[PDB]
């Protein structure tokens, strides 16, 4: 039944069999295919959270709420027990990236800052940016409500002028939205995805975001197109993914929202209910 997860497993199988063996910017071995595409149904509450290996759903939600706040302070995420950005905000990493002037936790003008304040001058995570720069997230919700057929509904973190200030240039580079049949769909352009850890997390994240926007706009959800540039498996993850490929997918979970959620800024951890998520165990990578 879960044909959509079967497609992710086929992408991993295709990469292992046909990918090129290349060392990345760190000197770490990868197996890579440039240019891959997959579609996931979001209909009837479905969020494409992989069942063949547990996805860090708590991390997905807290990260997304922290993006929506426009927050770039890794400590605010770490304080909810989500440490995924902590390495990139560490005194050691900041100094290595020539950000010696930044406070620990300051990731620079990454996703949250771009989504809510695109074009504003970044002056550190502790600065108040209220009403500074372009609120892309507000703008795309305005377009979906007022001009649902627009070909111009883009959320982009790839701010060229800001790339040098970021802890990391964005892997999930831009997302286009469209409405058909009163159904909101999303196409995510991901320049770089590790099939082991990153890509499943990112699929859950953009699936959830599309549902949250659809909810606040009074729309059903259609599909998520996932477009990859460098689709890769780290050499030291090959055995873990060969393990995952032996597993048969279960049905994807569904999401529903509780409370009086009127705007994108009103979602809380507690307002987001994930239903029937029973994955096989996380695999050690
Ligand atoms: O949301 C994210 C963040 C990172 N990565 C992975 C992809 C790469 O393996 C690495 C980023 O390295 P570059 O592509 O920037 O070299 O992290 C993802 O897959 N998703």
UniProtKB/TrEMBL annotation:
Q: Which family does it belong to?
A: Belongs to the thymidylate synthase family.
Pathway given for this chain reads: Pyrimidine metabolism; dTTP biosynthesis
Annotated Thymidylate synthase/dCMP hydroxymethylase domain ranges read: 7-285
EC nos: 2.1.1.45
Q: Name one GO biological process term.
A: methylation
Instruction: Provide the protein name.
Output: Thymidylate synthase
Q: Which GO terms describe its cellular component?
A: cytosol; mitochondrion
Entry-linked PANTHER family: THYMIDYLATE SYNTHASE, THYMIDYLATE SYNTHASE 1
UniProt xrefs under InterPro entries: Thymidate_synth/dCMP_Mease, Thymidate_synth/dCMP_Mease_dom, Thymidate_synth/dCMP_Mease_sf, Thymidylate_synthase, Thymidylate_synthase_AS
Which Gene3D superfamilies does this chain map to? Answer: Thymidylate synthase/dCMP hydroxymethylase domain
An example of a Pfam family matching this protein is Thymidylat_synt
Tell me what reaction this enzyme catalyses.
dUMP + (6R)-5,10-methylene-5,6,7,8-tetrahydrofolate = 7,8-dihydrofolate + dTMP
Say yes or no: keyword Transferase present. Answer: yes
Key words of the record: Methyltransferase, Nucleotide biosynthesis, Transferase
Specify which residues bind dUMP according to the UniProt entry for this protein. 25, 191-192, 194, 202, 232, 234
Active-site residues, as the UniProt record annotates them: 171
Q: Name one GO molecular function term.
A: thymidylate synthase activity
């Amino acid at each position: 039944k879960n044909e959509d997860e079967s497609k992710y497993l086929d992408q991993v199988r295709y990469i292992l069999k046909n990918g090129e063996r290349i060392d990345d910017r760190t000197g770490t071995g990868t197996i890579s295919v440039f240019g891959m595409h997959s579609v996931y149904s979001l209909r009837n509450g479905v969020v494409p959270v992989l069942t063949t290996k547990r996805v860090y759903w708590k991390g997905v939600v807290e990260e997304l709420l922290w993006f929506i706040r426009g927050d770039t302070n890794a400590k605010h995420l770490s304080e909810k027990g989500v440490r995924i950005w902590d390495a990139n905000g560490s005194r050691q990493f900041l100094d290595q990236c020539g950000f010696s002037d930044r406070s620990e936790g300051d990731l620079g003008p990454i996703y949250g800052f771009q989504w809510r304040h695109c074009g504003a001058e970044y002056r550190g995570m502790d600065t108040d940016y209220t009403n500074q720069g372009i609120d892309q997230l507000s703008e795309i919700i305005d377009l979906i409500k007022n001009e649902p057929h627009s070909r111009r509904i883009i959320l982009s973190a790839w701010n060229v002028k800001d790339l040098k200030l970021m802890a990391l240039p964005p892997c999930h580079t831009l997302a286009q939205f469209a409405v058909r049949n009163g159904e909101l769909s999303c196409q995510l352009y991901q320049r770089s995805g590790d099939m082991g850890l990153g890509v499943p997390f990112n699929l859950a994240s953009y699936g959830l975001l599309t549902h949250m926007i659809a909810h606040v706009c009074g729309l059903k959800t259609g599909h998520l197109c996932h477009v990859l540039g460098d689709a890769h498996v780290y050499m030291n993850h090959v055995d873990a993914l060969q393990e995952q490929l032996k597993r048969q997918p279960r049905q994807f979970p569904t999401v529903r929202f509780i409370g009086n959620i009127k705007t994108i800024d009103d979602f809380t951890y507690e307002s987001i209910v994930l239903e029937n998520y029973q994955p096989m165990p996380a695999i050690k990578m």
